[PDB]
């Protein structure tokens, strides 16, 4: 107990010393021989209309051609982004939905929200209509997000300090991940699909394993809860957007934050983040009706996609990197490039 | 410059748009009410007497209005991570119980209800959202007051063991917390457990909110 606390403090000090020792330089002190990108002029090419309420999430398909979007009127919609044509419209059972996902094979979609279950739908039937294939239950608090691993495994997080890995075909949890203290907000699968990352409403994030159940790493430093999270492509980085009006860049090997992303004229909290392919554009929403485009290696810009009349809640890029989609509380989706 | 198949795709998309608009127009007619209260505050008796896991929805109809009432108290989390989801509702129905004036929890249940009401009524998401306040268990309150005055929890009270004086003093002590009197408003009621007046009162408060919103909408 008390001796265990002493050991914990000693290990904490050793971890701090190890983190500080490797700090022979700072990213900004080395990344100061770089030409800034300058202005990024973007414009709306399409304007996807048809929702009649706030929009809470979207997600791109792996072909770079189809979209899925979820709104609080109780609707999932699938869009052709080359013509603004609707391919499917799916009605939900409850209208308190807060997340989406698109299957990497195009066969399935998933959704969830304030009803403590995750619903999985099959798109390609011989009968010519979309119908539910699974409903997963077992969580005790609300549901924040869910990302397919393949056609038969899905990982979910809930505002209970726990996450889970589910085997779709059977309907029984295969492993659970516990150790937080507050709600969990968002997680991003790795490109290689062998780990994941989880941020909780206590200004704490973690790097989590998949088949063991045991967390590999922890990270702190923000002042308040974390609103969004994602994963820089190379496999060992990720950027946090928090509700204390800040972004920061965490790396796994250095075991400490390197660079911060803030501006005094901003007093709001970020509702969603995302990266660009090469790593030279970090896109982030805000509650001040904008959708900024920061430069990752410099912390020296914000190119604004000022087209909305309300808070930007969701934004994302493609796999070929030729577009960007954004959705906000004004019920419109916009495509930029 | 469309081929034979793109025109069929476009026809399909227009069908989908037609159905979406029909559904939205049908769904733009209903009223949404958020229901709140403290532990054992008696929201259960309000849900029951009117003949009507996660969130629990109930719904009903009254005089050509379709009400959806959402109870979210079945969750134990941090309150601040939801209310954005509810900033559109018409009104908030807040229930407290009168008989619990001198039941110490430390300090009393009424102090807990005062803290809760003060927290909710001045939240930043609810500036135009009105509150309908229910005070329950008036009979047992009067029976208790006959021997134990409000001085136990309201030492500054000036009246004696009189039902009207104590009840009015408590009512004003709660209706004082409205710090946005120029945009928000507070309604107050006494649970008529044997009467139907409760639903009519909800109807009246909702209609007032509707009329005020329509006047504000068109500049007039």
């Amino acid at each position: 107990l008390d001796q265990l606390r002493q050991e914990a403090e000693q290990l904490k000090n050793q971890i701090r010393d190890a983190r500080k020792a490797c700090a022979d330089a700072t990213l900004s002190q080395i990344t100061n021989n770089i030409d800034p990108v300058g202005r990024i002029q973007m414009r709306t090419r399409r304007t996807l209309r048809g929702h009649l309420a706030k929009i809470y999430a979207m997600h791109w398909g792996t072909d770079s051609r189809l979209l899925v979007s979820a709104s609080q009127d109780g609707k999932l919609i699938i869009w052709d982004s080359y013509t603004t044509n609707k391919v499917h419209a799916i009605p939900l059972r409850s209208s308190w939905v807060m997340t989406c996902a698109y299957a990497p094979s195009g066969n399935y979609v998933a959704c969830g929200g304030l009803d403590n279950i995750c619903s999985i739908y099959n798109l390609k039937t011989r009968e010519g209509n979309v119908r539910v294939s699974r409903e997963l239950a077992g969580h005790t608090g609300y549901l924040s997000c869910c990302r397919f691993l393949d056609d038969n495994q899905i990982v979910t997080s809930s505002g209970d300090t726990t996450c889970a890995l589910w085997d779709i075909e059977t309907g029984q949890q295969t492993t659970t991940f516990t150790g937080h203290t507050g709600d969990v907000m968002s997680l991003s699968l790795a490109p290689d699909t062998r780990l994941f990352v989880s941020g909780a409403c206590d200004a704490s994030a973690k790097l989590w394993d998949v088949r063991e159940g045991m967390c590999r790493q922890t990270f702190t430093g923000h002042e308040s809860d974390i609103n969004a999270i994602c994963f820089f492509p190379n496999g060992n980085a990720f950027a946090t957007g928090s509700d204390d009006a800040t972004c920061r860049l965490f790396d796994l090997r250095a075991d400490q934050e390197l660079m911060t992303y803030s501006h005094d004229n901003i007093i709001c909290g970020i509702t969603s983040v995302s990266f660009s392919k090469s790593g030279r554009l970090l896109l982030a929403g805000y509650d001040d009706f904008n959708c900024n485009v920061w430069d990752a290696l410099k912390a020296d810009r914000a190119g604004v996609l000022a087209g909305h009349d309300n808070r930007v809640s969701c934004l994302g890029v493609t796999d070929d990197g030729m577009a960007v989609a954004t959705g906000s509380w004004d019920s419109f989706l916009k495509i930029w490039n | 410059t469309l081929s034979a198949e793109d025109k069929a795709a476009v026809e399909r998309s227009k069908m989908i748009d037609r159905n979406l608009r029909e559904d939205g127009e049908k769904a733009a007619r209903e009223v949404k009410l958020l229901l709140l209260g403290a532990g054992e505050s008696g929201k259960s008796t309000i849900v029951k007497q009117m003949k009507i896991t996660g969130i629990v929805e109930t719904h009903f109809t009254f005089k050509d209005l379709h009400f959806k009432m959402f109870d979210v108290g079945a969750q134990r989390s941090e309150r601040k991570k939801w209310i954005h989801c509810f900033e559109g509702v018409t009104a908030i129905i807040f229930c407290v119980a009168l008989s619990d004036y001198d039941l110490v929890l430390a300090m009393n249940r009424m102090h807990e209800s005062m803290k809760l009401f003060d927290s909710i009524c001045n939240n930043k998401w609810f500036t135009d959202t009105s509150i309908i306040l229910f005070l329950n268990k008036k009979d047992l309150f009067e029976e208790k007051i006959k021997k134990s005055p409000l001085t136990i929890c309201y030492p500054e009270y000036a009246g004696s063991n009189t039902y009207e004086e104590a009840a009015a003093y408590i009512q004003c002590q709660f209706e004082d917390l409205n710090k946005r009197k120029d945009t928000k408003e507070i309604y107050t009621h006494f649970t008529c457990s044997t009467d139907t007046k409760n639903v009519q009162f909800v109807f009246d408060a909702v209609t007032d909110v509707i009329i005020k919103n329509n006047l504000k909408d068109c500049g007039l």
Partner: single-chain antibody, 231 residues
Framework: VQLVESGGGLVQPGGSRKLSCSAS????????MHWVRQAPEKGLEWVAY????????YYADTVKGRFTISRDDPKNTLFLQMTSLRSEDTAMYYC??????????????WGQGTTLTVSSDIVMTQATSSVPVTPGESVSISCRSS???????????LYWFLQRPGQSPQLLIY???NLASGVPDRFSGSGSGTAFTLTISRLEAEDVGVYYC?????????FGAGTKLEL
């Protein structure tokens, strides 16, 4: 999935006749419908087309004006009405299904068909009407056209169908390269505008019949002459 047609028989010169088709096992009110026909010993011929929502209709120039096409969704039925029939209109008639959205597969399920007896567009041809083959032989078939099919949006509206002796046709290759569901992977097809080739590897039994090629670039729809593998 199931489509069943009825209403055939004999009709003397003049008069009229109505054919009906009942569908079961799918969402009838999301599909468009075609009526197709075949002469006793010749190739296929398209007859008419009705769309989903009844907002579009097409006929064949050959006999336009005498044929009416209608549908009824609440009861899931399709009707064709014909009048003043001639001797030229002795043939068998099929009903066909098709659904268009980005990535779908039209013409996949074919009905069974009924027999009826009476007392400036694109051309396409098969090189040969017969070919001798043996098991284990790599077979290929050809088709020729009079104009490019490759539309400037990237597609190529060539289709390949197969009819075995005593059965209905069965979609093999849609849009010139894509395999329908349920087809063994030993089939394939390709080609360059106006000259196309299908190819069957490792010929087995039940691969003997008649092979057809069709185009879907612009109404009217034109079939081929029909090729036969003899074995």
């Amino acid at each position: 999935v199931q489509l069943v047609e009825s209403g055939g028989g004999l009709v003397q010169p003049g008069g009229s006749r109505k054919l009906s088709c009942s569908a079961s096992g799918f969402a009838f009110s999301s599909f468009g419908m075609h009526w197709v026909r075949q002469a006793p010993e010749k190739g296929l011929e398209w007859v008419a087309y009705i769309s989903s929502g009844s907002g579009t209709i097409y006929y064949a120039d050959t006999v336009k004006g005498r044929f009416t096409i209608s549908r009824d969704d609440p009861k899931n039925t399709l009707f064709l009405q014909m009048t003043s029939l001639r001797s030229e209109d002795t043939a068998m008639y099929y009903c066909v299904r098709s659904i268009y959205y980005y990535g779908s597969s039209p013409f996949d399920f074919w009905g069974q068909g009924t027999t009826l007896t009476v007392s400036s567009d694109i051309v396409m041809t098969q090189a040969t009407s017969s070919v001798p083959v043996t098991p284990g032989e790599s077979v290929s078939i050809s088709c020729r056209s009079s104009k490019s099919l490759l539309h400037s949006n990237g597609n190529t509206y060539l289709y390949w169908f197969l009819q075995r002796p005593g059965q209905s046709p069965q979609l093999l290759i849609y849009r010139m390269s894509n395999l329908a569901s349920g087809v063994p992977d030993r089939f394939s097809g390709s080609g360059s505008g106006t000259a196309f080739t299908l190819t069957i590897s490792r010929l087995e039994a039940e691969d003997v019949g008649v092979y057809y090629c069709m185009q879907h670039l612009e109404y009217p729809l034109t079939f081929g002459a029909g090729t036969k593998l003899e074995l």
